[PDB]
Amino acid sequence: LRFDVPLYTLAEASRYLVVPRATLATWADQPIITALPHPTGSHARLPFVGIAEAYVLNAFRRAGVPMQRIRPSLDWLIKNVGPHALASQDLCTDGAEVLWRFAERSGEGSPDDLVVRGLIVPRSGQYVFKEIVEHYLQQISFADDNLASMIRLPQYGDANVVLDPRRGYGQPVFDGSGVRVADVLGPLRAGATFQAVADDYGVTPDQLRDALDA
Amino acid sequence: LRFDVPLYTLAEASRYLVVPRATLATWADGQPIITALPHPTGSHARLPFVGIAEAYVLNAFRRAGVPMQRIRPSLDWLIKNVGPHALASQDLCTDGAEVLWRFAERSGEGSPDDLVVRGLIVPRSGQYVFKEIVEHYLQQISFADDNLASMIRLPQYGDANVVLDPRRGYGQPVFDGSGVRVADVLGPLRAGATFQAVADDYGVTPDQLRDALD
C-alpha cells in the first residue's frame, strides 16, 4: 500500500507533519521525496513512503540542518543504506556513521559538511545522530522490507496518533482504536462530553484532549 | 502588568494561541473584539496580556465551531452582565452560559446571535452549560486578585505545563515549573545536547522537553 498510490495531498501532509506546504512543494518538485503526478480531479501526490521521507527531512529541518543543498547527502545515503534510505529501518542505527564518511571527504565547512554537522555529534568517541533527530526517527515502525509502515505523530502526545496506510486511508488515527482523529471532532464540536466521545470512539478523555490540542 | 503595555505582536500571538495571524488582525483592528494598543515606535507589539487572554478565549470559541463574524453583540452582552473584559473573567466559565442563553432567547430562533450561542452551550441535567470542548480551554486560565486572567496554560504543550505569564519570560511561553522560556531549550537541543542534559540544565524533565518540542 506504500509505494504506487498517492495517498496525501501536500496540504494534508503539511498539517500532519507540521511543515509549511511550500516547503513540501519544493521537496516534491530535483525532488528529495517520493511524489507522483496528481490523479485526474485530485491533488494527491505523496505515496506513504514519500510522507515518511518528508517526515524524516522535516526532523532534519527542525534540527537546524541546512536543507537547500541536502540532495548530495541523500544520494550518498541511498547509495549506502539502500533505496528510500530516509524511510529505512537502518537509517537510525547506520546513518550517522555513513554521513560522517561523506562529510570527511567533502571539505571542512563545505555545504555537505554543514548538512552533516547539523545531524550528528560525537558520543563516547564515535559520531551518532543528535537526540533531537533520534526522537523523530524512533517514531517510525517498519514492514517486512525494512521500510516504514507506520509513523507515530508525537505532537498528539499520549493519544498515540499514527499515519498508517492500512487504516483511515493513511490519515491520522488513534493507533489504539483505529479511529480517524477527524471523526472525534464533530461530536465534541456538537457538545458531547469528553467522556461520551471517549467511550464512543474507544479512547480515553485524556487522549481526546491530547488529540484536540496537537 | 496586564493592561497598559503591549506584550505580544500578532505574529507571536498567532503562534502561541494556534490561530491564523489574519484572524487576530481582524479581532484587533476590527469594531475590535480584543484589547489591542497602537504599536510602539520601532515595534510590532499590539496585545497587552488581557488582550491575548480575550484572543485565547475567542479562539476556543472558534475551535468549537462558533460563527465568529457576528459575535460582537454577544460579547457586548457578556461585558454588560459579567463585567469589563468578561472574556478574561474568572466568572465567565461559571456564569457565562446562562447569561448567553438569556441573550439568544430574545434574539429569535436561528438569528446570528442564536447561532453564536448555540455554538457555545448545551443542555445538561436541565440547564444550559458551556460545551466541554469550550470548558477545556476556559479551565486553563488562572486569575489575579481582580478576577481577571493572570496566567494561561497552553494545552498544546501537554504535560510540559507551558504558560503565558506576564510575570515571567516577558509573557512568552515558559515552563510553569522552572520559569524557563521554551525558546531557551531549543538552541541547546539543536546543538546536539541530549534530552537528559538539557532537562537537567533547564529544570524540566526529558518527557516535558519532548512535549514542548512537539
Side-chain angles (χ1 to χ4, degrees), chain A residues 1-29 31-214, chain B residues 1-30 32-124 126-214:
Chain A
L1 340 80
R2 299 173 295 164
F3 305 92
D4 314 324
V5 25
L7 227 47
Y8 305 96
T9 67
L10 302 176
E12 284 153 5
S14 160
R15 296 185 235 123
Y16 312 152
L17 303 194
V18 194
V19 58
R21 190 218 156 91
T23 297
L24 286 182
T26 301
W27 298 351
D29 308 328
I32 57 172
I33 64 179
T34 305
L36 296 142
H38 80 75
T40 305
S42 148
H43 303 286
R45 291 280 269 124
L46 309 182
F48 185 80
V49 69
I51 210 172
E53 294 170 334
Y55 170 82
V56 172
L57 289 178
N58 197 36
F60 292 176
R61 184 179 75 107
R62 192 176 295 114
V65 176
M67 301 304 298
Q68 287 181 69
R69 299 170 179 268
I70 198 157
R71 187 173 177 256
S73 297
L74 302 184
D75 291 341
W76 172 265
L77 274 164
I78 290 162
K79 294 171 179 186
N80 289 277
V81 177
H84 297 298
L86 294 179
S88 171
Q89 182 163 5
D90 288 338
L91 175 70
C92 190
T93 53
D94 305 346
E97 182 186 346
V98 170
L99 286 163
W100 170 61
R101 292 195 248 117
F102 184 62
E104 278 191 274
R105 57 199 206 70
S106 278
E108 171 169 52
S110 64
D112 301 320
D113 188 41
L114 297 170
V115 167
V116 171
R117 276 156 39 175
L119 294 169
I120 72 176
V121 288
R123 195 199 140 80
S124 312
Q126 65 167 8
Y127 292 99
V128 299
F129 280 119
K130 294 179 181 172
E131 287 194 358
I132 190 179
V133 180
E134 276 192 340
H135 167 61
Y136 297 94
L137 300 191
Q138 279 162 353
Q139 307 310 316
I140 303 176
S141 289
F142 303 93
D144 259 5
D145 53 10
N146 297 115
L147 294 179
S149 60
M150 195 164 76
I151 306 155
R152 176 175 178 276
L153 306 175
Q155 69 265 217
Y156 293 88
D158 293 321
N160 303 314
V161 166
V162 299
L163 302 179
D164 177 352
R166 291 153 115 274
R167 304 181 280 173
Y169 319 109
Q171 303 171 26
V173 299
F174 292 100
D175 187 35
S177 68
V179 173
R180 287 186 333 160
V181 169
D183 289 332
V184 305
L185 300 185
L188 286 173
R189 292 184 190 152
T193 70
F194 282 94
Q195 187 62 244
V197 175
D199 295 343
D200 285 356
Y201 291 89
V203 286
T204 206
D206 280 351
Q207 286 176 324
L208 278 180
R209 285 164 201 114
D210 289 351
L212 202 56
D213 299 328
Chain B
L1 350 82
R2 297 174 294 158
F3 304 90
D4 313 326
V5 49
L7 267 41
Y8 305 98
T9 64
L10 301 177
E12 282 156 6
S14 162
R15 205 156 232 274
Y16 313 152
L17 303 196
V18 198
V19 56
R21 155 88 154 80
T23 300
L24 288 180
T26 298
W27 299 350
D29 290 341
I33 59 169
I34 66 176
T35 304
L37 293 151
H39 77 81
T41 39
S43 159
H44 289 111
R46 290 279 265 124
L47 314 185
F49 186 79
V50 70
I52 213 170
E54 299 169 328
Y56 171 81
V57 172
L58 287 175
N59 198 34
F61 289 178
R62 185 179 72 107
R63 188 180 292 113
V66 171
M68 302 302 297
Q69 303 109 118
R70 300 174 174 263
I71 199 156
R72 182 164 177 259
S74 301
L75 303 180
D76 290 342
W77 175 262
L78 275 164
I79 291 161
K80 294 175 182 181
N81 288 280
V82 182
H85 296 298
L87 295 177
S89 176
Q90 179 158 26
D91 289 339
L92 177 71
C93 189
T94 50
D95 306 346
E98 185 193 333
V99 166
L100 288 162
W101 169 64
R102 274 215 309 288
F103 184 62
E105 279 190 284
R106 60 190 201 80
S107 275
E109 173 167 64
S111 64
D113 300 326
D114 188 40
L115 296 173
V116 166
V117 172
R118 299 317 183 98
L120 295 165
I121 76 183
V122 289
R124 202 230 281 115
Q127 56 157 350
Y128 294 99
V129 297
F130 281 117
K131 292 183 180 169
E132 286 195 2
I133 192 179
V134 177
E135 275 196 325
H136 171 54
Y137 296 93
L138 301 189
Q139 276 165 351
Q140 307 309 315
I141 302 171
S142 286
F143 302 92
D145 261 13
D146 54 9
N147 302 115
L148 295 180
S150 65
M151 192 157 82
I152 311 161
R153 176 179 180 272
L154 308 174
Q156 67 270 214
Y157 291 91
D159 292 319
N161 302 319
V162 169
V163 297
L164 299 185
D165 178 353
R167 296 200 190 291
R168 297 180 286 171
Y170 315 112
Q172 307 184 4
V174 298
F175 294 98
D176 187 29
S178 66
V180 172
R181 285 188 331 160
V182 171
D184 288 332
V185 304
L186 300 189
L189 290 173
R190 289 182 193 152
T194 69
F195 283 96
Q196 189 60 249
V198 178
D200 296 344
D201 281 357
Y202 292 88
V204 290
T205 209
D207 281 350
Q208 294 177 312
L209 276 180
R210 283 163 203 114
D211 290 347
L213 203 53
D214 295 328

